[PDB]
Design a binder for this molecule. Structure first.
Ligand SMILES: CC(C)CCC[C@@H](C)[C@H]1CC[C@H]2[C@@H]3CC=C4C[C@@H](O)CC[C@]4(C)[C@H]3CC[C@]12C
Ligand SMILES: CC(C)CCC[C@@H](C)[C@H]1CC[C@H]2[C@@H]3CC=C4C[C@@H](O)CC[C@]4(C)[C@H]3CC[C@]12C
Ligand SMILES: CC(C)CCC[C@@H](C)[C@H]1CC[C@H]2[C@@H]3CC=C4C[C@@H](O)CC[C@]4(C)[C@H]3CC[C@]12C
Ligand SMILES: CC(C)c1nc2cc(O)ccc2c(=O)n1-c1ccc(C#N)cc1
Ligand SMILES: CC(C)c1nc2cc(O)ccc2c(=O)n1-c1ccc(C#N)cc1
Ligand SMILES: CC(C)c1nc2cc(O)ccc2c(=O)n1-c1ccc(C#N)cc1
Lengths: 531, 222, 101, 531
């Protein structure tokens, strides 16, 4: 099973001998026979090499351009350019998975991808290779975006083939030109709108394990497509949602502020301010109900893996968690428990903290919020672990020294914490023996945490800012891109016609002769060189 | 003390623990004094296990560099100012902070953001008292403390790339220490690699070497 | 310079003294050249010795970095690993780790 | 007077024509005639060009190597290679002043300096050109160090001349050699010991206007000469002075600490602690007298310009000021005034701050102190100016708002200053009208000074650290070098024989044939290339 299905034709291509493969083809050796061996499969837990499980793909994946043309343009036995393995990966799919985003492999794969598309048009004019999907139902374009192959995704998106009768395989066209000025179109098909896997959908709705999902939106069609989606309709809908949440969170703030302080809720209706407060309290629960149902609407439609629900898209959880706090308030309010206030102030504090969601849509706010994110997961977490070891380590030493009031682990942890915030007493208690021991414990704690730990946290954040400053504009654009796609799905949901980016334009001719119309996106470039 | 101070600090805590037992059975109340230093050092010794975690270990390596490169330089100059101005202040104070300890503590509180600036009025020449405190504040708080943050940032910048190599060395010493202590009977179940035929002795005998496998992928040099 | 001069004097020793193993010889301090390079911090020659691959037949047994097999872009390379983690007196890992800073 | 003294021979060399100058020399035109024109002088307040006021130096300063050889190796009229202008600058002096430390000029001057030394040996074997001093009494070597010409100072110090019969003009010799190893000597004459102007003395005792005085000690002979002067004898004398000052400043601390608090000094003698305290008080005045006389000893021997006494050598000023405080203390003590306590606590604080002088002699302490000085002179002054503007403005506004107790400009300046140190009340007074005005004034002050000014001072120091980190090891070495030379002058002062660096060694032969002995400094270098 380790090499099951392997034929002598596989070894000839493996050894890189064009004469040896010719003899086997001449003798009738099977060319479509597939090596369904685990060594030839991915099998990430074991060493091996994946190439597409086909002799034809072996030549393509091993830079054997002649053997690819040999297996297709010969006379004895012509290989199938549309052949799919057990996984269903076409040779185009195999070329995508071989790519590993390094400099040399990208030039390799994007080249071999070109001619095998060029050859297929000459040999199978009516067949469209890229439209074929594997058993996973992913086209090579969708697989490159899914697996993070930015090197070949950039190639496919802005592909232009100069040679006639195969120009219709191109994706980046040209409407016209001038002296220094030329306007170039983009195919834009299966990019923003598609049946199953759009390029924008797969790049945005990734699991954060994708290598270059931030930079995959930087390729030329995607950045301008998302930016114009923002400017056309998404920006105003986002600003409307921002205003509604601000209005909702101010109504909730005033209803909580003017809550009655008498016992045993619910509270009876009196005067005129109670009807205004209950009015604002009804709208608060409605917003809590809306954010509760929008959360499960998010869980059912995207099915998070419980790993990409806390690291990414935690904003969805924190909005859902606030709704949970709001619904718990209503349960406790009608249960006559005073603990409804405890849940209501956590819903109030989290609800106002959730106002930081809308820092995307503003470039300087969004980049700032992306940097705030990086500190918590890179600097604050490391600081707090070491700080809590010191804080709990010295508090237990101090409270053991304290005798017969700070003789409590909580009262001592609070006094030592005040040192962090510039409010350290250093003489908060005198109820002990061994005053020298007490002073040495506090002075050691002060030097280790205040002078050393806190000042070094500032030094570490500056190092974090330096590295992430250039890249944080790409995380923000990804965060806004997810907002752009989420807005489209929620808003239109009836016709999907007013937000159509680009326009249907005649780009060329089908090789049969029919007119091909592609929803194309226009980009104008100016070059003062290459006249 | 420079390297393997973790062994010293773990041994020193044990010395504090054994001194506690000596004083506990000697009927001295000072066993508590030794026991809280054993408690505080024992919890500080919990930072030994920050190795074995990459981001914790690199963080702990950077913490170590500050103490031996930035904190030590700062404390020498700071203590000169602290003791230099405390003696000037406590000498001005008359007939209660008229103690070198009580004045060193008041001037230290300025460092931690708790400086009174009016803690005592028992002196003559109020202008002298204010000029001494304002000079101390500007020299240590505005200048010395803010410059320590500036120096740590320069230390972080230089050691950021290299600190992944000190951590791996620290974990490597832990890896070898674990091997020696754990097995210590057979040394068979933890051996790396495997005996594999690599070639032939020039005489003609088969040579078997415990070899470690590495797989590399190169898309150039076909 | 050194990693070259070290090479041929090993190649020549194989041709001239096939039965003799030069690297196994220890000085009065009881340290082999491999252990001495790790002890004294000679990373330039320690890197050479550890992944030494000699192409010459009849001299290939002096290599320390072998090759199990190969593929188109893929090749698996072995390493001698002898006197590295386990050794009688001075392992490379032991001497590098148990240094004096 | 603008071009007075200029001859036609000057114009021919100016125009760079070797044929034209030949005709004038053939016709008897004066070659030693000097153009004593202000346009040909330095005259930094007016445009011009200085070249040495001689036709021969014009060729040297204008890269006219042939004309230099023409004016010296011809038959009709030979120019004087030892000719000096009105300022007395020899052509070697002129070449030094032309150099401006740029990359191309250094190759220019250090070359032209070489061959004009070549010709002098061949044409005037008994004459020594470099030993000639101008009207200022400075040799070309001393002038290059004085004016900051590091490019040519490096050339002169480590000069090796390959030509036989010209090798005795070299300054960097070679004792022997090995395979990769070779030991090279250095002339070391007029470097550490000289009659008037040593290279070490002039570089160290500069006015801080010299361009590269920090880097002028980095040239190969000077760094190792000063480092070995440190290790031989200066280091232990410095550590002895550090210990004596520590002992003196602790005796002074204890005498001040245990001062009697009764009225009307001097105080009578009782018990046994008063004799111990007066003993410590006698030694305190003696140290004050010693630092007073050492200060004037510094003023008389070096004569500071009152500009290089505050920016550089402020350590001398601060020690002298502490001595002045001590003498004022004695005067007030014997005048029965209580203000001796004020003068003496100022003396105590300044004397303990003076303990930072001895941070030189320790590399890390010295670099740290140099960085502290850079902060004080670069960031702290700017911050204090802007901060004092803000503090005074808002304090005047607040104390004007305050009515009928913080109704004092001092009491309000102190309350607003406490905000800087993390002790700001924000509610220190309620004796006013217009509570909103009071809050807006304080909140504006807090945001402008605490959140903005203080946090940006930390940001500026980090930028200062980044730039000065590499160079601060060179300011420290200069500061230690001044300490090394100061120690030599003070310590030996009788024989100047035990600290002699290097040794008298036979380097070669005088061109006459006599043995030349130079106090030479040995440096051993290892090169594994150039076999
Ligand atoms: C009572 C409420 C308001 C407390 C304050 C809000 C808290 C819960 C919010 C505000 C900022 C949030 C964090 C922002 C960034 C990150 C990094 C991300 O990769 C994981 C989640 C994490 C770590 C978030 C966790 C929840 C968080 C800490
Ligand atoms: C009472 C106890 C807990 C005091 C706090 C723990 C002290 C003793 C520990 C915590 C961190 C430790 C330091 C960590 C880093 C270094 C750098 C190293 O090259 C020398 C030792 C030195 C300087 C350690 C000395 C001891 C140390 C300061
Ligand atoms: C008597 C009390 C106030 C003593 C306090 C110490 C004061 C006076 C000392 C300590 C540090 C010193 C400074 C250190 C560095 C510099 C930079 C230099 O280019 C000019 C002098 C200057 C600005 C010094 C001025 C005096 C100074 C501020
Ligand atoms: C950490 C930032 C400030 C943040 N904090 C939140 C807190 C919440 O309670 C809920 C949601 C958020 C939230 O979305 N962000 C966030 C993240 C990325 C971008 C970008 N680009 C914009 C905003
Ligand atoms: C300074 C750090 C935080 C530290 N502090 C300790 C304190 C003690 O009291 C005892 C031991 C330690 C200790 O080992 N480290 C340390 C050092 C290097 C690495 C790495 N890589 C991991 C941890
Ligand atoms: C600013 C530093 C801390 C300082 N402060 C002083 C304060 C005084 O009151 C008197 C003298 C000094 C003093 O010399 N330095 C200083 C300067 C340079 C070098 C170097 N290299 C070493 C020390």
């Amino acid at each position: 099973s380790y090499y099951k299905g392997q034929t002598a034709l596989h070894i000839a291509i493996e050894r890189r001998n064009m004469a040896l493969v010719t003899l086997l083809v001449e003798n009738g050796a099977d060319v479509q026979a597939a090596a369904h061996g685990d060594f030839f499969k991915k099998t990430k837990g074991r060493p091996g090499f994946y190439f597409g499980e086909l002799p034809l793909s072996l030549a393509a994946c091993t830079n054997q351009l002649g053997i690819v043309k040999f297996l297709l343009q010969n006379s004895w036995q012509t290989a199938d350019i549309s052949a799919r393995d057990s996984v269903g990966n076409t040779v185009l799919h195999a070329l995508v998975e071989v790519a590993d985003n390094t400099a040399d492999n990208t030039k390799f794969v994007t080249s071999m991808y070109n001619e095998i598309l060029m050859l297929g048009a000459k040999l199978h004019p009516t067949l469209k290779l890229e439209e074929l999907t594997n058993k996973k139902g992913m086209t090579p374009l969708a697989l490159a975006a899914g697996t993070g192959k930015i090197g070949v995704l950039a190639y496919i998106l802005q592909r232009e083939i100069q040679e006639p009768e195969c120009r219709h395989l191109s994706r980046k066209f040209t409407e016209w030109a001038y002296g220094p000025v030329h306007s170039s179109l983009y195919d834009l098909s299966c990019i923003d709108t598609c049946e199953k896997n759009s390029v924008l959908e797969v790049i945005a709705y990734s699991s954060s394990e994708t290598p270059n999902r931030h930079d995959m939106l930087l390729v030329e069609p995607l950045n301008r497509l998302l930016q114009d989606k923002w400017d056309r309709f998404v920006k105003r809908i986002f600003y409307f949602n921002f205003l509604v949440y601000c209005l909702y969170m101010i109504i909730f703030t005033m209803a909580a502020y003017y809550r009655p302080v008498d016992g045993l809720p619910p509270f009876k209706m009196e005067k005129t301010g109670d009807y205004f407060r209950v009015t604002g309290e009804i709208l608060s629960v409605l917003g809590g109900v809306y954010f509760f149902f929008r959360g499960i609407q998010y869980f059912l439609q995207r099915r998070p893996s419980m790993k990409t629900l806390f690291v990414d898209s935690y904003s969805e959880m924190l909005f859902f968690l606030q709704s949970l706090f709001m619904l718990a308030t209503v349960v406790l309010y009608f249960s006559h428990l005073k603990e409804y206030v405890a849940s209501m102030v956590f819903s109030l504090a989290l609800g106002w903290t959730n106002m930081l969601y809308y820092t995307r849509g503003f470039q300087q706010m969004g980049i700032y919020a992306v940097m705030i994110e990086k500190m918590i997961l890179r600097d604050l977490c490391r600081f707090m672990f070491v700080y809590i070891v010191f804080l709990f380590g010295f508090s237990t030493a101090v409270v053991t020294l304290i005798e017969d009031s700070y003789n409590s682990l909580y009262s001592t942890c609070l006094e030592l914490f005040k040192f962090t915030i510039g409010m350290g007493d250093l003489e908060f208690t005198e109820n002990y023996d061994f005053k020298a021991v007490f002073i040495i414990l506090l002075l050691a704690y002060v030097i280790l945490t205040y002078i050393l730990l806190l000042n070094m946290l500032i030094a570490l954040m500056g190092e974090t800012v330096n590295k992430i400053a250039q890249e944080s504009k790409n995380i923000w654009k990804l965060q806004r891109a997810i907002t752009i796609l989420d807005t489209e799905k929620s808003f239109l949901k009836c016709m999907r016609k007013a937000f159509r980016s680009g326009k249907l334009l005649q780009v060329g001719y089908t090789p049969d002769g029919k007119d091909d119309y592609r929803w194309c996106f226009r980009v104008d470039e100016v070059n003062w060189t290459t006249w």
